[PDB]
From Swiss-Prot, chains A, B:
Key words of the record: Calmodulin-binding, Disease variant, Epilepsy, Glycoprotein, Intellectual disability, Ion channel, Ion transport, Isopeptide bond, Membrane, Phosphoprotein, Potassium, Potassium channel, Potassium transport, Transmembrane, Transmembrane helix, Transport, Ubl conjugation, Voltage-gated channel
Protein name, UniProt field: Voltage-gated delayed rectifier potassium channel KCNH5
GO cellular component: cell surface; plasma membrane; voltage-gated potassium channel complex
Location (main, coarse): membrane
Length: 660, 660
């Protein structure tokens, strides 16, 4: 999202003299000249290569009407031109121009922007300068005088038996320009060529979720079909697998239409880079996966889809807590399938026919009740019972519980069971991503116990003091807890830029700036020079803020609550809404001191600025010493001693005068 | 707890001219004018809308006795009045007054406060000003001249065929005032309307504990009655459940008489807000809970009471350690009930009648000894044995121990047992809120081992030095441990307000301020300007504090212990109680230097202030340069060289003079 003049202009654009043209009034520039104007064709900035696109000061020649009003007139008119204006170049000649302007209008709907494409040729038609006439200096040196537009595409002689090509690329090249330059101040689409899907579109995320679901389906269902050797003849499961496979094929195809993430920048949507990137990084595995026992068991490599893109959805919420139990279930299922395979291999009696009284299948058949019969060895536990028993055994082993009604008995089973035990140990160690959330809970427990210890030890080490003080401390600590629960206001603002931290400080206050009728005529410059300095205090009842105990060093305002100002054990000031106390500093440069015992009534909020950071801003913004030095209504200055008369002493002092 | 003039005055009060009246002597104010006096009825602050309630300076008219001493006399008398004094308003007229004052006395028992309610009407009786007499400017413009009291309640013409209503609301409105304004400086009750229970009353906490106990009762006892299908015909358990239900109904009713917690502020005790709050948030669940198998099993939703208010009592002490074992017991009981239900469903033989030789009930009956008999299938393990066996099995599974004498054998039991294993894994992971307290213990272990490593590695990296130095270091480290165990004095004081941190600093010292006879005539302004700067050091024997190795930059006092002052290997100064050393700075502005080798005798405590922070305070408190510059008794200044005579050299030097 930008004014779109250089994000993709440094790569495909060509020689030009790109202007800005963005409302103007005064003189009128050309600014930077692109793709071949570093230091060999024109002047530098702060000059006619930064300003003054009116053909002038690139002059160094004679005043001809043929050289003055050719392009200098039809610049802000933009229809079509080939006129030859004079703009001095390296060859020191009365340069004469061919071009093909291309018009465009604006984005802000104000007739602001124009494409402003130049070509700036000299040699092609006539150089007629006569600084030195030593034969071939201007007649046959025609091919050596200028190195600019000629050195862009066609570096040979302008005629060179190819006059048409040379004079049809510098007279009219709008065919290769126009849409080839990034159009206007239109906030550009985030680098999206046609028929490419952005990797943060609402479509791609749904596609990823669908492929994840199908990956879990295949990981769950393939080993079960491999081990239990169920008869394949069916209807529903016969066609669903083909649908799943074709979905993965569609995913492989569609992976060439998605944006590739850049190395630290933003999206890279090059139609060529994406293809080689994918082919190099992850095409072989998906090719093998989505193509007999080996053929149907190699399909497990589809888990690369989950492994590769795991970062997108690891923390959509409380998802790791589900991921761990999911991998637990999958490893349990795989080990159960292997266990049933071993059990089925052990029985069948290792050739001949004599039931092994050892392998756990015989024991399961004996315990359930259904025995083995010989017809040729048919009849036994049903398929569902076999699978659930295998899963139950693997669950007993992996959770490190162990029951023993189903347990290894033969030799091979014992070689398997030790490896299964070690893998289960490692995995049960791995499970503790959940005791992280449990650790947040138990850490809250420790923090509460810590605050309890803090309170008790503080109270004891105090050598004991009047309990009112401890009560005040406890109330203040719990209060400061319950408007600032966990996250502070300081560390948050120290990880910010200077300007965005100023933004945070300016929209934090918003209650004297946008509510008090003094901050009106300041858009963003005075306020952000001040709003970074108002600190908001949450007052507490009974507090002495600027009592006869300190020196006045801060203007204060009230936004929520009321402040009490004692004047030697007697009162006139209880403040209301938007009421100021404290000495004025904008026309005084004079100091006041401790002449009050100001108390606090409610749970108030004050806005306080130190003296040092207030005078500086108003000094710099001296023009704002008019709107913030006459619109402040002084409620009660702590500078002049207020005046206020007893109704219960004058009566009695006049009474005491008649008796004496 | 406040002077109670605006906490609930901005919402229900009406137009008035609220005064302060809080002892006075000098001139006598009116201060702020409420509910309709922003900028359209009177002047601004620092004026007769901040001071001078004597009717004056709001004058702009002629001196009539009818306009001078109507309300200006009967202001500090407060009996009853309708007199028409002159107070200039927007309409530029000799304003004439109707009011009804309401009297009140004080809170401090000194005849201080008065309610001071005004009405300030102009138009009603007679405006007789003649600035412009163009027909209807004062005769029919009567309804447009003033926008103040008329724009409060009755905005129409004073007569408007409703003279009684208009002239009975601005002549006497004490019926709608008085108790409708927050009364006096009486420290107000914490916003308690009648017949509402505060959520921190000693009653509500007991109610919460009782409902928690009954919730645990019902959660324990309902599933047992659901599963074991015990005969309901009884006496004690027949009526107790009804009592429990009526207690929950009483709780539902009483939940509309409790204070609702505010969004970050303090209690909200609005009789209307509480009702809708509760009804929206948690009424439906409690309605369903406290209304056949479904009817008696839906009662478990009473756990919302425990879940909702869990924050109040999570850390009354070591309570999480009990909460975890409680939830462990409850989940064990629920799973045991489900297990017994499955076991009882399996036997009964799934229609027909032939005992299943698989389900664990048959195995339990065989192992205990009591078999099953057919009469129709009656006789077996007793109810208590059945329940305890189910609980034992669920405990074996949940603690991941596993024994195997009672183990799943059938099919359904194995489908249940795997889900039970996974849930047990998650819950046993969750249990570690206890290894938090164990973590405090084991963290103490690590900290001790850390200090051991610290000591050893320091000693070795020292490249070895005389062992006395290491002994001093070790003693100092353990000493600084054993008066500052864990909690410091710095981080505690950096989370404090400026004033409350000053409070902590002022009552930390208390041993020269309240014990030395120099800090007497300073209430809270001088001391808190100094007490923030005395830092207390705990001295160590043998230490050289201000020896001939540094420059004197701090006054010091002794509070506990004694200091030794060497004068070139000979002594006169060993200090006692409240004894000062160091050069004086209040009448010198002169510097001293290293002229001693002052040692340390006991484990002493000194109070030290840097030079920079002592001269400033006494300069500002120049009037206190009289009570703290003549009441300090100089024990031994490190400024003048002390004088003290050998008794073992003069004798011997006179001896050596007779032999030479």
């Amino acid at each position: 999202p930008q004014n779109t003049f250089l994000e993709n202009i440094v790569r495909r654009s060509s020689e030009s003299s790109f202007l800005l043209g963005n409302a103007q009034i005064v003189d009128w520039p050309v600014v930077y000249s692109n793709d071949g104007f570093c230091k060999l064709s024109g002047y530098h900035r702060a000059d006619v290569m930064q300003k003054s696109s009116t053909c002038s000061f690139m002059y160094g020649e004679l005043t001809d009407k043929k050289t003055i009003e050719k392009v200098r007139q039809t610049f802000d008119n933009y229809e079509s031109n080939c006129f030859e204006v004079l703009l001095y170049k390296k060859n020191r000649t009365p340069v004469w121009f061919y071009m093909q302007i291309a018009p465009i209008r604006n984005e802000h709907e104000k007739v602001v922007l124009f494409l402003c494409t130049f070509k700036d040729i000299t040699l092609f038609k006539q150089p007629i300068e006569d600084d030195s006439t030593k034969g071939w200096t201007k007649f046959a040196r025609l091919t050596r005088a200028l190195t600019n537009s000629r050195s862009v595409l066609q570096q040979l002689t302008p005629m060179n038996k190819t006059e048409v090509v040379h004079k049809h690329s510098r007279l009219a090249e709008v065919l290769q320009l126009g849409s080839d330059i990034l159009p206007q101040y239109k906030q550009e689409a985030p680098k999206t060529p046609p028929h490419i899907i952005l990797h943060y579109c609402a479509f791609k995320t749904t596609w990823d979720w669908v492929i994840l679901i199908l990956t879990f389906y295949t990981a769950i269902m393939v080993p079960y079909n491999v081990s239990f050797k169920t008869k394949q003849n069916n209807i529903a499961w016969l066609v669903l697998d083909s649908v799943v496979d074709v979905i993965f094929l569609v995913d492989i195809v569609l992976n060439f239409h998605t944006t590739f993430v850049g190395p630290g920048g933003e999206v890279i949507s090059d139609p060529k880079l994406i293809r080689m990137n994918y082919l190099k990084t992850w095409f072989v595995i998906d090719l093998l996966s989505c193509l007999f026992s080996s053929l149907k068991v190699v399909r497990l490599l589809r888990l690369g889809r989950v492994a590769r893109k795991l970062d997108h959805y690891l923390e959509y919420g409380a998802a790791v807590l589900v991921l761990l139990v999911c991998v637990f279930g999958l490893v349990a299922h795989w080990l159960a399938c292997i266990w049933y395979s071993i059990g089925d291999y052990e029985v069948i009696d290792e050739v001949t026919n004599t039931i092994q009284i050892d392998s756990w299948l015989y024991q399961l058949a004996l315990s359930i009740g259904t025995p083995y019969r010989y017809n040729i060895w048919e009849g036994g536990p049903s398929k569902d019972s076999l699978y659930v028993s295998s899963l139950y055994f693997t669950m007993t082993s992996l959770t490190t519980i162990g029951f023993g009604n189903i347990a290894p008995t033969t030799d091979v089973e014992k070689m398997f069971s030790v490896a299964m035990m070690m893998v289960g140990s490692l995995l049960y160690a791995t499970i503790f991503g959940n005791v992280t959330t449990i650790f947040q809970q138990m850490y809250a427990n420790t923090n509460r116990y810590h605050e309890m210890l803090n309170n008790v030890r503080d109270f004891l080490k105090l050598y004991q003091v009047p309990k009112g003080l401890s009560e005040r401390v406890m109330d203040y600590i719990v209060s400061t807890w319950s408007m600032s629960k966990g996250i502070d206001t300081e560390k948050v603002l120290s990880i910010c830029p200077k300007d965005m931290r100023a933004d945070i400080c300016v929209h934090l206050n918003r209650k004297v700036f946008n509510e008090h009728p003094a901050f009106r005529l300041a858009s963003d410059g005075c306020l952000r020079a001040l709003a970074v300095e108002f600190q908001t205090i949450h007052c507490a009842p009974g507090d002495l803020i600027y009592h006869a105990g300190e020196s006045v060093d801060a203007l204060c305002f009230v936004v929520s609550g009321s402040l009490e100002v004692i004047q030697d054990d007697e009162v006139v000031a209880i403040l209301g809404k938007g009421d100021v106390f404290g000495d004025i500093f904008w026309k005084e440069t004079t100091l006041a001191h401790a002449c009050a015992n100001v108390r606090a009534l409610t749970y108030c909020d004050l806005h306080i600025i130190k003296r040092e950071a207030l005078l500086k801003v108003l000094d710099f913004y001296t023009a704002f010493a008019n709107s913030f030095s006459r619109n402040l209504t002084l409620t009660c200055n702590l500078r002049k001693r207020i005046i206020f008369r007893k109704i219960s002493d004058v009566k009695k002092e006049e009474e005491e005068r008649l008796r004496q």
